[PDB]
């Protein structure tokens, strides 16, 4: 069994008959989280390691952001705080705020991987030009150059318990506001600020989330369905080597009128390596079956995985590490 | 379960000697200098061949890049100086923490397909221009600039699954040598490094150096320094190492351990460390064998041939080729 393109969600907090015959099928390569599956720890813990039990090549996601976009909130997951706190420390403390930023990296992987989540689908590079509502607190600051060294450093926290990371929403949704939101900035000037998070991080970046956005001047697709954006500036110019996840093709102005689909033939033919089908576990069957889409992004898939060991939560509440980032947490914010 | 003593091999093929002391309870580590690599297959043979006998051995080298770097033939990248990044830093700061984490991705990589668990690097100590042994093994003299470089090489570090070491704390900067400044003024710069770092910083070797105004004991058997500032102050949860302590020596190492390291270094002298095995008192500490265990490098490594064939790595190495031309 090796990781298909789709990336898709269960039906409920235990798993049905219907979802390991998804999960079991060849174009299957993902599971995402959200807090309807989540009811406790223990509950999620079994889940999870049900999902690994039926394919073993699973990725499972989710997105923990923290602030307004954190899916579980309860039964001892740290509320973290919304990234522009840590942009606003920043302003105060540079040095404080890159140490709080791993902090937060480390405690958000942690709790995920007691629980066997492999991911989260963070960081927010769109800059705080303060445009965008969809965005907001979600951004760390205006400065591409501040977004870059907390995020590299949230990154870092990440990378300690094992635990990649997904920059997003390429090449920029803070400039946008929404039909599809229109960004009508040349290349140049996108190119300029709201890319260069994505290439000054480097190996630190491991895969990125198109938006959901069109740049007028720069091609009519929007970036996931873009060919000019994946290839051309990421994988082109930019030389990005990581994975590639569209956003959910559930949102139907992206789709510019095609079925869920033509719409994953387009991204995954544009350049992501994995599609999101989200709340719809039947449509995405449907996905699944009629895809008419690789070694390369196989690989790159596979990398996405957690790495090494993790601890369970009656170890992980007891170490060292996890109590020291949880109390610099508190006192810095 | 790991002892505390970290000790060198004879050379490059296990010894029967090698394998009785390696099998000893109090091992738990090799250290590795450039007499022990010929090639990468004796190498990786030599590696092998010590888990053989103690599977839960942390394996450990001096690579820092420049001036120190013990494996530099074979395909091993011959990694630039520290001093070459804050160069480039004073240049370009956003590529200057690109090129640090290429530089700590190659580093990391290379040993791991070797069979290595660690290198202990980076040097924190800052650069005064004062210090002819660390020299431009320093990153910067701004304690801020050596903290966000080391940062970004161990992030480097971590990408592959290696940890990492700074060194030598409280700092050799200013500086057996002896320091005379206030604990004050040795707080507020050589330090700093130690304390933003937080959890980006894994473990520690203290200077063989005395902080005269602090304590007549060198850093490593000082509890003040160790238990009152890193542990205490600093709140540092990490693996403590103990320099060199060939630089009794069975109690040296008990003093070393009973003022805060975790692991004592015995260098270049495997008879003498056969001694300090069979005669130590110390008894660890289950907290220090769980700072050990978090030494050992995480996860898979790539063989040689696969690692120089991936995507990331080359782009490091192109990335390493262009910025620090």
Do not use: C
């Given at each position: 069994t090796t990781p298909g393109p789709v990336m898709l969600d269960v039906v409920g907090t235990t798993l049905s008959r219907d979802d390991a015959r998804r999960l079991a099928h060849p174009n299957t390569g993902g599971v995402i989280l959200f807090a309807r599956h989540f009811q406790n720890r223990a509950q999620l813990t079994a889940l999870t390691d049900s999902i690994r039990a039926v394919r073993e090549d699973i990725l499972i996601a989710v997105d923990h952001e923290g602030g307004r976009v954190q899916r579980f909130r309860t039964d001892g997951f740290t509320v973290l705080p919304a990234m522009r706190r840590l942009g606003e420390l920043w302003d105060r403390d540079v040095l404080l705020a890159t140490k709080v930023a791993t902090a937060v990296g480390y405690i958000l992987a942690a709790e995920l991987r007691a629980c066997g989540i492999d991911m989260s689908?963070?960081?927010?590079?769109?800059?705080?030009?303060?445009?965008?509502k969809v965005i907001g607190d979600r951004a760390f600051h205006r400065d591409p150059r501040v977004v870059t060294l907390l995020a590299k450093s949230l990154n870092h926290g990440l990378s300690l318990a094992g635990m990649a990371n997904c920059g997003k929403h390429f090449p920029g949704h803070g400039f946008a506001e929404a039909a599809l939101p229109t960004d009508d900035r040349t290349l140049d000037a996108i190119l300029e600020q709201d890319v260069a998070p994505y290439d000054w991080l480097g190996l630190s970046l491991a895969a990125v989330i198109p938006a959901h956005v069109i740049y007028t001047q720069v091609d009519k697709r929007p970036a996931g369905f873009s060919r000019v954006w994946?290839?051309?500036?990421?994988?082109?110019?930019?030389g990005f080597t990581g994975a590639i996840f569209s956003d959910?093709?559930?949102?139907?102005?992206?789709?510019?009128?095609?079925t869920l689909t033509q719409a994953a033939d387009a991204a995954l033919a544009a350049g992501c390596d994995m599609v999101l089908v989200c709340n719809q576990p039947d449509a995405a069957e449907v996905v699944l079956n009629g895809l008419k889409a690789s070694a390369e992004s196989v690989r790159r898939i596979k990398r996405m995985r957690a790495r090494g060991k993790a601890l369970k939560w009656d170890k992980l509440i007891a170490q060292p590490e996890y109590l020291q980032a949880q109390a610099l947490l508190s006192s810095a914010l």
């Open positions: 689908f963070t960081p927010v590079l769109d800059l705080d030009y303060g445009h965008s994946l290839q051309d500036i990421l994988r082109g110019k930019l959910d093709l559930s949102m139907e102005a992206a789709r510019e009128g095609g």
